[PDB]
């Protein structure tokens, strides 16, 4: 039961790329007809906070990654294909703009 | 540009405890009046999927963690206090029940 120091929490939760379990439906929202397997994939994506109403944590460098995913159409069997997903290598706190 | 094998994706995204950036407002929803700093904290929490409509990823062993967080009331300055947060040590896919 050791407390985490304010400086350290602040540091640790500041905007950065963190491994994120993302739903494949979120990434591929036009595929309504399919059920995916697994439902989700791990991706390096921006996360944490900027603690400043004017700033957002956003990717400044991206890259791609490709995985075999099983697409399951009802009464039509399962085909395993390759799907691609963006990943975030660098994140910054940057000004929101409307 | 190397592909991830289906077996490996499946394995890697299956229900497990993963470091998660959680908004403190989510964890402490009665504190409307305060702004927290940082907005969020990193916690080990259950995540990923069970790929089976009948199952949910849920914690089977929990523990606590304590952090200094800055509470900011408007026109009333900032006080740094200790807040506690549940963490998830073990996760299982378990049957949903209504």
């Amino acid at each position: 039961h050791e407390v985490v120091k304010f400086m350290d929490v602040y540091q640790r939760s500041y905007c950065h790329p963190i491994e994120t379990l993302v739903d494949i439906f979120q990434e591929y929202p036009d595929e309504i007809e399919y059920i995916f397997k697994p439902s989700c994939v791990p991706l390096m994506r921006c996360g944490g906070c900027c603690n400043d109403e004017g700033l957002e944590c956003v990717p400044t460098e991206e890259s791609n990654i490709t995985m075999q995913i099983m697409r399951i159409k009802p009464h039509q069997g399962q085909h395993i294909g390759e799907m691609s997903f963006l990943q975030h290598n660098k994140c910054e706190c940057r000004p929101k703009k409307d | 540009h190397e592909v991830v094998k289906f077996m490996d994706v499946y394995q890697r995204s299956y229900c497990h405890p993963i470091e998660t950036l959680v908004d403190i407002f989510q964890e402490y929803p009665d504190e409307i009046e305060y702004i927290f700093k940082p907005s969020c904290v990193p916690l080990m929490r259950c995540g990923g999927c069970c790929n089976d409509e009948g199952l949910e990823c849920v914690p089977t062993e929990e523990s606590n963690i304590t952090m200094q967080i800055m509470r900011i009331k408007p026109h009333q300055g900032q006080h740094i206090g200790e807040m506690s947060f549940l963490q998830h040590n073990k996760c299982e896919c378990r049957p949903k029940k209504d």
Partner: antibody
Amino acid sequence: EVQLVESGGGLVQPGGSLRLSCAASGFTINASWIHWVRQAPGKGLEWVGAIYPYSGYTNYADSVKGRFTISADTSKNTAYLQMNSLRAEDTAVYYCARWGHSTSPWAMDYWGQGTLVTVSS
Amino acid sequence: DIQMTQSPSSLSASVGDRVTITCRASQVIRRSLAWYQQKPGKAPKLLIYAASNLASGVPSRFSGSGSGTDFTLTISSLQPEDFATYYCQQSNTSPLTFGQGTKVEIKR
């Protein structure tokens, strides 16, 4: 044009006191964290402590706790390192430096020139 | 406290050599390692932050990598003015401990 300017370096008696001062321009120290780092002559850098001027939060090295006090003056845009009960092994060049939103935390991209605090009878 | 162990303590390389300097953390540091260069009697200069990003306006021959507890600064083509002492620093847990620095010499 961000710079940090230090002053206050000098000679001091063992046991005595000194207030290093770190004057910012080009940004507001309020909207950032100021750290202090020192370097014993010939040795490597050691972190002294930091301050979050918005709130006055401070965090110090165990090697320096209870003796040193970091402080800030948002109106005068200036941080301060207050040295008490000084020792021989406290003889070093003292740096202040700042962390802002441009970099991820504690990567400090602008520093002061450094003053030499030398503790001697 | 987290101990940071740099290696080598000193190295001597020729101009245009690719030089690497490793830094090893006693526990995991998420990726919060930064690399500073220090020319004698001057403030350190930030080179790399968050393990792997180039600090603004630093020459690209400077490159950082590593994940876990093992990290590396790489100068890809050592230049006459790269002569300096390089330090790594860990930001994950106070105190913010530095490596003991690697003292790079140009061999001519």
